[PDB]
Design a protein around this ligand. Structure first.
Ligand SMILES: CCCCCCCCO[C@H]1O[C@H](CO)[C@@H](O)[C@H](O)[C@@H]1O
Ligand SMILES: CCCCCCCCO[C@H]1O[C@H](CO)[C@@H](O)[C@H](O)[C@@H]1O
Ligand SMILES: CCCCCCCCO[C@H]1O[C@H](CO)[C@@H](O)[C@H](O)[C@@H]1O
Ligand SMILES: CCCCCCCCO[C@H]1O[C@H](CO)[C@@H](O)[C@H](O)[C@@H]1O
Ligand SMILES: CCCCCCCCO[C@H]1O[C@H](CO)[C@@H](O)[C@H](O)[C@@H]1O
Ligand SMILES: CCCCCCCCO[C@H]1O[C@H](CO)[C@@H](O)[C@H](O)[C@@H]1O
Ligand SMILES: CCCCCCCCO[C@H]1O[C@H](CO)[C@@H](O)[C@H](O)[C@@H]1O
Ligand SMILES: CCCCCCCCO[C@H]1O[C@H](CO)[C@@H](O)[C@H](O)[C@@H]1O
Ligand SMILES: [Hg+2]
Ligand SMILES: [Hg+2]
Ligand SMILES: [Hg+2]
Ligand SMILES: [Hg+2]
Ligand SMILES: [Hg+2]
Ligand SMILES: [Hg+2]
Ligand SMILES: [Hg+2]
Ligand SMILES: [Hg+2]
Ligand SMILES: [Hg+2]
Ligand SMILES: [Hg+2]
Ligand SMILES: [Hg+2]
Ligand SMILES: [Hg+2]
Ligand SMILES: [Hg+2]
Ligand SMILES: [Hg+2]
Ligand SMILES: [Hg+2]
Ligand SMILES: [Hg+2]
Lengths: 233, 233, 233, 233
């Protein structure tokens, strides 16, 4: 619970939980006829994966579960450069294992088609859920990634009352999904996008680069804003 | 509030609340025409029964309310073997009393049919809400049971900030229902499955064995992972 | 914030907030075409009125906002008999003022009809939303009132971690509404039922006696169970 | 994080987040065919913007994000007159930048029409979502603004347990939206109304004066009630 391999295991398990729960709710439950959970149910699910695992393993690894979080916290002066790559690998691996099991579960229902349905992948333009342009996709992911990082930096500030951060951060995740699912299906998380794109297997992989660079640039901006403008004291 | 019969009463009352509230929301409110609460409303209800009773009686018994939780915590080194069976009996009894009163309440509406409607029971294949295969049912219940146990172990770790665990655990329950209702109607709780199966009275009882072994195996895996991989320090 | 007239003002304001917010969400928003909030949105609203005011004025009066809570806490040995009646009056008055303003607001939309729509009143049988029998109404209100009191006693126990009770109690209120709206429109609160019945002006007033005796009997049972079975230590 | 320009930056960022998230969820997600989030999803989004930023930057500026909050806290004796105007400017500026980026994002979907759709603006009468009269609009905004201020004063009282206020206040915001969206689309926040009215560009601007005076009068009333009736001790 403090040697690096335990932190990496925590990060893998937490990103697994995020992908399995968030994407799983989208694939299995969102569009279920009459009773299905909708975009709002998916948004809640994503936020709860983050809230629950932040409480469960946050005291072990920091509970990032998201390459743009790790890199943003590096930019914000909160996390060492030398640990970044190990965390990103752990997150990507955890997420892919989750998408794999989800793919197996989803395949047990007649008619399931990962490629055709999109398998909860992030896309823009032709592949945005609401047909939003690439420019709309860029602006929304940049803003929401920066804000998510600003919220993470603030809620874990020296002077923020202790213990509440998993609630602030997890519900910031729900919020972000409530806003942006129609635009990009909501990434703000390169590991989540990657895990699911692998099984969609087509356009998701062709557009994947976008859901690495934009959330990471946004997260860096959020970390820099907090570090340079809000933190001092 | 610390002699065993008070702990057993707490466990019975808490499992009663889980079954009455979670299953009750499903039976009475989920499909109500136009205004009904849907799968997302049921998921919220299940999580709130756990959150509320964990705050109410967690300081008395540990607030398990779930045979797979009790057994998983035993596997994780958090709970003594000698207390396991008493807790499981208390949970099963509490749950059956709840399903009985729910059955009475539900029967007060013209047309109600427990057997035909399924009475919120857990099933797979032919009896999965979305027609998922037995293999889909196995994987989802194994993963979500293990994760639920991992979340419970982590949120109650020595180094997790105090007081927040009922929130982490209750909302993990909501999450689990948001994901898996279409697959199995969501068990991860052998006492919940049993209580309701008794009144459905048919296929629910024929498939009940599955919702004992799979959540318990999953909970044991989650406890072992936390104990052997994440806990040390 | 501790002399009795401040406590009574807190109780009046808090019950006003409960009635205005819970009933208001039901009257104004629940059935709004396409976008309306449904039973689940109303349940959330009721729970949030309780959560928010418990945090706002709980440190002043105890934050009961509900005659069955006050009386149940008396039964549970937590609240003095000599203060009960003043609290009940304050709650009833606060609630009626709220229903009055809500009635005014609702009347500003063409077609509004308090009597015909039911104005969010509690009823059974012919006047149950789902056509549930009087016996169904009795059992559900008895169980949910007792459980609500058990949750309140437990979450505010000596050994419950401090500060979290408004969350446990407010979300127990949401849960209770998620379960029972189809049966009785959910009372568990005699002051809420009274305030709204006055403006429905017909069957609501004829059935009002029921939503005084049943929640109060239930609350007393919950308080007695906690006091006599769960509290000692 | 305590010199005034950091507090003003916090207030600008927080009001940006409120407008971008709350209005954004309304513009992009509320009416999305089949899966859209509805009024309840928007209400949740508004409350989460406030909850998340209150945790993130509340320890910096007080986390007002709302001209009626700033002015109400002045009225309640909690905030100095000399800092009011700077906060109000910061909130208005933050909000307008957010509406501008939202306008850009929304414009990336074929058919988008800010003026015709209303762009999430607040209105009454002809421009109330449910066709409520100006009098209905007045009463609901007055009551909900006063209550929101009462909740803010209480949750941050000397004797309220520490750390929980962002939860009480953010969820009070969700509640307020659950109630009143059909009446006015919910203001209780002059900066939110202004930011969005600018881009609707028509009736929203003609009715804007109303969503300055009414929330501010209401907030002042709430602050005065708490200060003069509830606070002493
Ligand atoms: C640590 C893991 C980093 C994974 C980054 C994956 C980015 C892949 O991104 C890109 O690669 C393909 C091959 O060139 C291109 O054809 C696609 O357009 C694709 O988006
Ligand atoms: C971190 C691991 C992610 C690897 C991303 C590389 C994606 C490869 O990229 C390609 O693969 C598809 C399948 O052959 C092709 O159809 C697409 O054109 C795509 O660009
Ligand atoms: C402590 C309570 C444990 C209850 C375990 C119940 C498991 C019952 O399980 C099984 O038993 C029946 C009779 O053999 C079989 O016909 C069914 O297939 C059924 O699933
Ligand atoms: C913990 C108590 C649970 C007891 C589970 C035993 C279920 C009995 O099992 C049987 O009972 C049904 C009714 O007769 C039969 O129709 C089914 O075939 C079922 O297997
Ligand atoms: C402190 C406030 C207590 C209010 C209790 C109100 C109970 C009214 O209850 C009853 O009174 C009417 C007149 O007899 C009867 O006709 C109705 O059936 C009604 O339900
Ligand atoms: C706490 C104050 C609540 C007073 C409850 C008394 C209700 C009076 O009761 C009566 O009033 C109606 C209107 O005239 C009649 O139509 C009904 O028959 C009803 O029983
Ligand atoms: C600090 C920012 C305060 C902004 C207050 C904006 C109030 C504008 O309000 C009014 O002004 C217009 C011009 O007279 C009128 O035509 C409109 O009816 C409008 O509502
Ligand atoms: C804080 C900045 C807000 C400025 C509010 C002033 C609104 C101007 O007000 C006017 O502008 C519209 C556009 O020309 C006109 O069509 C309307 O009649 C409106 O009253
Ligand atoms: Hg994340
Ligand atoms: Hg996230
Ligand atoms: Hg996120
Ligand atoms: Hg995410
Ligand atoms: Hg459980
Ligand atoms: Hg559970
Ligand atoms: Hg569970
Ligand atoms: Hg459960
Ligand atoms: Hg209540
Ligand atoms: Hg209540
Ligand atoms: Hg209640
Ligand atoms: Hg209530
Ligand atoms: Hg606000
Ligand atoms: Hg607000
Ligand atoms: Hg508000
Ligand atoms: Hg607001």
């Amino acid at each position: 619970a403090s040697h690096m391999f335990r932190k990496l295991a925590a990060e893998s398990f937490g990103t697994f939980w995020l992908v399995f729960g968030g994407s799983g709710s989208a694939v299995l439950a969102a569009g279920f006829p009459e009773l299905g959970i909708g975009f709002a149910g998916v948004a809640l699910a994503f936020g709860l994966t983050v809230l629950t695992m932040a409480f469960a393993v946050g005291h072990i690894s920091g509970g990032h579960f998201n390459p743009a979080v790790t890199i943003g916290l590096w930019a914000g002066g909160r996390f060492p450069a030398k640990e970044v790559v190990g965390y990103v690998i752990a997150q990507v691996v955890g997420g892919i294992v989750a998408a794999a099991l989800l793919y197996l579960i989803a395949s047990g229902k007649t008619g399931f088609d990962a490629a055709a349905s999109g398998f909860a992948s992030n896309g823009y333009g032709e592949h945005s859920p609401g047909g939003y342009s690439m420019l709309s996709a860029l602006v929304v992911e940049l803003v929401l990634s920066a804000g998510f990082l600003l919220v993470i930096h603030g809620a874990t500030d020296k002077f923020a009352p202790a213990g509440f951060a998993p609630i602030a951060i997890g519900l910031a995740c729900t919020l972000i999904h409530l806003i942006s699912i129609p635009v990009t299906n909501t990434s703000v998380n390169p590991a989540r996008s990657t895990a699911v794109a692998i099984f969609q297997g087509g356009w998701a992989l062709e557009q994947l680069w976008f859901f690495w660079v934009v959330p990471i640039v946004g997260g860096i901006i959020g970390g820099l804003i907090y570090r340079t403008l809000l933190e001092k004291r």
